[PDB]
Design a protein around this ligand. Sequence first.
Ligand SMILES: *CCC(=O)N1CCN(c2ncnc3c(F)c(-c4ccccc4C(F)(F)F)c(Cl)cc23)CC1
Ligand SMILES: Nc1nc2c(ncn2[C@@H]2O[C@H](COP(=O)(O)OP(=O)(O)O)[C@@H](O)[C@H]2O)c(=O)[nH]1
Ligand SMILES: [Mg+2]
Length: 170
Amino acid sequence: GMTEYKLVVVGACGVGKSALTIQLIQNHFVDEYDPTIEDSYRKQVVIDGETSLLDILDTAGQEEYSAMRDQYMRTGEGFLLVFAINNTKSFEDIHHYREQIKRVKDSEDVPMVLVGNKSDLPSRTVDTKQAQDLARSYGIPFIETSAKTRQGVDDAFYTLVREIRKHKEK
Ligand SMILES: *CCC(=O)N1CCN(c2ncnc3c(F)c(-c4ccccc4C(F)(F)F)c(Cl)cc23)CC1
Ligand SMILES: Nc1nc2c(ncn2[C@@H]2O[C@H](COP(=O)(O)OP(=O)(O)O)[C@@H](O)[C@H]2O)c(=O)[nH]1
Ligand SMILES: [Mg+2]
C-alpha cells in the first residue's frame, strides 16, 4: 500500500490539539470539541511529491497511564508537542510530554515538533525565543500555529512527516 505516517498530537488540556487536528483533516476551525473525545483521523496528502496516508491520533480524555495508552503511544512514529502561547503552564508541561514519549519509545531519538498554538491571541505569556531555545535543546523544529486562522497548521504536520523521514534514513 501507500506510505503511512502514524502521528500523535499531545499536550495539556485546552492547548488546541483537537482544533489543530480538525483544521488538518477538515480545513475549518472548531470552537468546541469535547475534551473527552480521543480519536484518530486518516487523511491522504501529498508532501514533497510523496503521496501518503496520515493517521493522526488526537489524545484526550484524562491523565491516566493505561496499558492500552502506553502500547498505543508506542506505535506513534512522530509527535506534535503542543502548548498554547497564552498559557505558561502548558509550556512548562512540555517537559512531561517529552519525557513520557521518551519513556514509552525507549529512545532519545523520536520524531517530534514543538508547536506553539493560539498565535492569533494578543495575550502572549510564552516568548517565541523561549520556545525556540527549548526546541533547539531538544534538537527538534518549532512551529507557531493558530488553529483559529489555520496559520502554520500544514507546516506543523508536514514538518513532523519530514522529521519521520529523517529518522527513517538513519
Ligand atoms: C483535557 C483532555 C486532554 O486533552 N488530555 C487529558 C490529559 N492527557 C494527558 N495528561 C497528562 N499526561 C498525559 C500523558 F503523559 C500521555 C502519555 C502517556 C503515555 C505515553 C506518552 C504520553 C504523552 F502524551 F506523550 F505524554 C497521554 Cl497520551 C496523555 C496525557 C492527554 C490530554
Ligand atoms: N484563539 C484560538 N483559540 C483556539 C486555538 N486552538 C484552539 N482554540 C480554542 O481553545 C479551546 C481548546 O481547544 P481544543 O482544540 O479543544 O484543545 P485540546 O483540549 O488540546 O484538544 C477551544 O475553545 C478552542 O476553540 C487557536 O489557535 N486560537
Ligand atoms: Mg481535545
